[PDB]
Amino acid sequence: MVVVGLDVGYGDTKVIGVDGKRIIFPSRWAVTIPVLSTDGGQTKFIYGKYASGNNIRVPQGDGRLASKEAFPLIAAALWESGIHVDLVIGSGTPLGTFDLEVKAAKEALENKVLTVTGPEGEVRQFNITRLIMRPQGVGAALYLLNQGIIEQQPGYGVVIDVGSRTTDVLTINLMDMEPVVELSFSLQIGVGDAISALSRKIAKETGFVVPFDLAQEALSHPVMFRQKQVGGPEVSGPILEDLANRIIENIRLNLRGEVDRVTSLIPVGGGSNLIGDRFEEIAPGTLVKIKPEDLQFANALGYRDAAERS
Numbered sequence: 433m434v435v436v437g438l439d440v441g442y443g444d445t446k447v448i449g450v451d452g453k454r455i456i457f458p459s460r461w462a463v464t465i466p467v468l469s470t471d472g473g474q475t476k477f478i479y480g481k482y483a484s485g486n487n488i489r490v491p492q493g494d495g496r497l498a499s500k501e502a503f504p505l506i507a508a509a510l511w512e513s514g515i516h517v518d519l520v521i522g523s524g525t526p527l528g529t530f531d532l533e534v535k536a537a538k539e540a541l542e543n544k545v546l547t548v549t550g551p552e553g554e555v556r557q558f559n560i561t562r563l564i565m566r567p568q569g570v571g572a573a574l575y576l577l578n579q580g581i582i583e584q585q586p587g588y589g590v591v592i593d594v595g596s597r598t599t600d601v602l603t604i605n606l607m608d609m610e611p612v613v614e615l616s617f618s619l620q621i622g623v624g625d626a627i628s629a630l631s632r633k634i635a636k637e638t639g640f641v642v643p644f645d646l647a648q649e650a651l652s653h654p655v656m657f658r659q660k661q662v663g664g665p666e667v668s669g670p671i672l673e674d675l676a677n678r679i680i681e682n683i684r685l686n687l688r689g690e691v692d693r694v695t696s697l698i699p700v701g702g703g704s705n706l707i708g709d710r711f712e713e714i715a716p717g718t719l720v721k722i723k724p725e726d727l728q729f730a731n732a733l734g735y736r737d738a739a740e741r742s
């Protein structure tokens with residue numbers, strides 16, 4: 433058994449390979465720097481950073497592995513995973529739809545054989561034995577439980593997963609690491625919002641259209657496109673505080689009175705890299721320390737862990 437843990441998110445796909453190497457390609461694949469192929473040859477796509485264009489595929493849901501917008505990424509994951517196989521895949525999808533979405537994922541990948549072709553004519557064949565699935569938010573909880581960054585006890589943990597499109601909050605009861613369904617939800621407010629809050633912002637003062645990835649970067653660090661130096665953090669406050677507040681307010685709205693049973697607050701996901709610390713005020717000195725580099729990967733890391741435990 434090779435074990436991979438995989439997290440195909442609207443923005444980035446995240447994968448954890450052999451001896452826990454961390455692959456991660458932007459979640460986008462257009463048909464035509466590897467061309468790969470699930471059809472043996474007939475068909476062929478670029479993925480990741482090197483797909484630019486108009487007829488460009490993307491995920492239309494978080495954690496939707498049975499989706500036809502997802503396959504070429506999964507395929508592309510098992511590529512960069514580094515099998516020198518018989519793999520188990522550990523993954524997640526949000527709690528709201530957790531059950532349906534597990535079902536499709538098993539139909540589309542359990543006991544099936546993804547056959548795939550890259551440069552200089554190379555076949556690789558993964559037989560997928562099983563699919564372990566855990567809700568998004570739980571993946572990240574475990575991994576931190578395994579690392580001792582959190583521990584079991586009385587009270588409730590709140591994993592706040594800042595994503596690219598959605599912010600995904602999962603209230604978990606520490607006694608038993610079981611999610612509290614009624615106290616668990618998804619905002620449709622992510623990082624893009626801060627991004628576009630910026631691309632938009634540029635032209636409405638500067639002049640041209642500032643494209644995706646400079647815009648992404650610009651949230652955390654300054655930029656240049658056409659010898660034009662647009663972007664930077666002291667500007668970026670007025671955005672990310674709103675992004676942050678919107679997220680925060682919306683959490684008080686959902687959680688309420690029940691914000692008193694909260695012992696740990698657990699910023700996770702890529703965006704906690706900008707507005708993470710800002711989340712203390714929901715319930716202060718319940719924050720839980722996590723290495724910046726571990727934030728986009730807490731879930732995948734935990735989906736794989738889960739995979740081994742069985």
Ligand SMILES: Nc1ncnc2c1ncn2[C@@H]1O[C@H](COP(=O)(O)OP(=O)(O)O)[C@@H](O)[C@H]1O
Pocket residue numbers: 440441442443444445594595596597598622623648652701702703704705706728
């Ligand atoms: N180290 C980084 N520095 C600044 N921002 C980051 C960093 N890593 C991730 N982010 C931001 O958080 C965003 C979303 O996180 P992520 O969960 O990876 O995407 P997804 O929404 O697909 O789950 C990223 O797209 C990126 O803009």
Ligand SMILES: [Mg+2]
Pocket residue numbers: 441442494594595596701
């Ligand atoms: Mg995500």
